[PDB]
Amino acid sequence: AQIINGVFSQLLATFPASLANRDQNEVNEIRRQWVLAFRENGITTMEQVNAGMRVARRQNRPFLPSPGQFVAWCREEASVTAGLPNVSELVDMVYEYCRKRGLYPDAESYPWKSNAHYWLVTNLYQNMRANALTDAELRRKAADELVHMTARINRGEAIPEPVKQLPVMGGRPLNRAQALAKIAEIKAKFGLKGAS
Amino acid sequence: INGVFSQLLATFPASLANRDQNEVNEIRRQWVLAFRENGITTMEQVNAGMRVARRQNRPFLPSPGQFVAWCREEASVTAGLPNVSELVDMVYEYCRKRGLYPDAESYPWKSNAHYWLVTNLYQNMRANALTDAELRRKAADELVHMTARINRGEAIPEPVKQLPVMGGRPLNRAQALAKIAEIKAKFGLKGAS
Incomplete structure (x- = not known):
């Protein structure tokens, strides 16, 4: 009661024109909301x-902001770990990825900022390419993601840390002459090559 | 603080009506x-x-957030951008006139921002079949x-441009015919004559 009245008074002081006309x-209905x-949100502390x-x-x-907006504002300090790009930033990242991913061997080689960016961008890219989405559909999908x-x-x-896929090995100290000698040795051992 | 509030009351006397x-104390506290929070602690x-x-x-009386927005807008008031109506008129003039120019960079642009805005709106309109109201909404968003x-x-990038064209040919009909005859003589191909 007292807390709610104080909140309403502070909001009126900050936004005098909100309840004008x-x-x-309507004021009572807004207060009830x-x-x-x-x-419902458990906001029962003055802090x-x-x-x-x-x-x-x-x-x-x-x-005057909506009650849910105020609750989100209050929980931003509590939910400070939710560091994620917005819809526009995510769409720009998806566009940049769709431009630049052809220059890398795999999706994990892309310079990702974090695992959340990796998962979001990969899911949006696959969904867009598979379902032939437009720009507005892409933005709606980004909001849903x-x-x-x-x-x-x-x-x-916990956000998983990709999967990767195998090494590639290497390390061949073999030149043309030695490999030609190896081919000749194989031919001599197997005899019936008849290759010239 | 107190002087700031007094000046605000003097400039907007109708704010504290009734x-x-x-309420005045709560407004002052806010x-x-x-x-x-905004770091406004200096008299300047x-x-x-x-x-x-x-x-x-x-x-x-604007809200304190609105006051901070006004302060930061006036501090960064340097913005030579057109309004929605002017932008739409520029887009219409561009769509009328750009067919007579070699490329989009040859158009007499006023600045880089106008170039980017008009070109993006033109591409979006011609790609998504926008109507007039959709065009105005897109212009506002842009x-x-x-x-x-x-x-x-x-900073706003400075287009991309695309290549010069060169030229400077002092060749006429007789010299060209002589060159063709020389090419024929060198390689044969007598059937071409």
Whole structure:
């Protein structure tokens, strides 16, 4: 009650024009929605309120944010490990990969920033090439992949470290003359080569 | 701090209309917290923000985030970008006139930003069969993206160009016929005559 009233007062102070030209019924409904969101998200501490207010002040939008946006702002400090590119950055990375991957032996040789980037870019690239997606479909798929990856990260879990595929060996100290001698020796031993 | 709040109240007297002391104190606390977080602790930045607010024609009190956005926009006000209508007119003029030029770099561009915006919009329109409303939406998105890139400090690349053409041939009909005859004599091929 007191916490909710303080949050509402601070939001009104930060955003005076948010409730302009609005009757009391809309204000009460907005307050009820905020109460429901706080109860469902477990936001019952003043420290989270202060963090959310700091983020809101850092935000430059002159309108009242949605309750879910405020909850996300509060949890950003808690969920600081969720360092992932946004939709636009992911799309640009996918385009750069689609341009540059032909110059590398495999997908693991690409200069990845982290495993999350590797998995996201590879999945989006394969999906796009297999399903012949357009740009808007690619962006929708990128948003879905980001949501899925964030959900997996927030549930703990560990991102696997590719698979790689074998070494290539090498180290041949053999020249033309010695190999010709070897071929001649094989011919002499097997006799019926008849090759000239 | 207190002087900053007093100047803000003086510039926007209608902001505290029908407000009690508690709301004023909460507004002051919010402004103090915003200044602390944004690093606005010097009087020179306060004066710059006051000048920005005075240049604005809105008597309404902007949010502290909006005030910081105004300050950083005026600090980086160097942006010679057209509006949506001007961009659409430029795109239409380009689509009318570019057929008479050897390449897209020969077009009389005003700057690099205009070149990139117009070319990207032209390619997108001719590739996705955009209508007029879709063209305007795409133009708005492109302008937002270009402004965001410019505010990041990133420089705008200088097209790519493609090759010179050379020339300078002082050869006429008689000399060309002599050359052809010499080629025929050297290699035979008498059937060509």
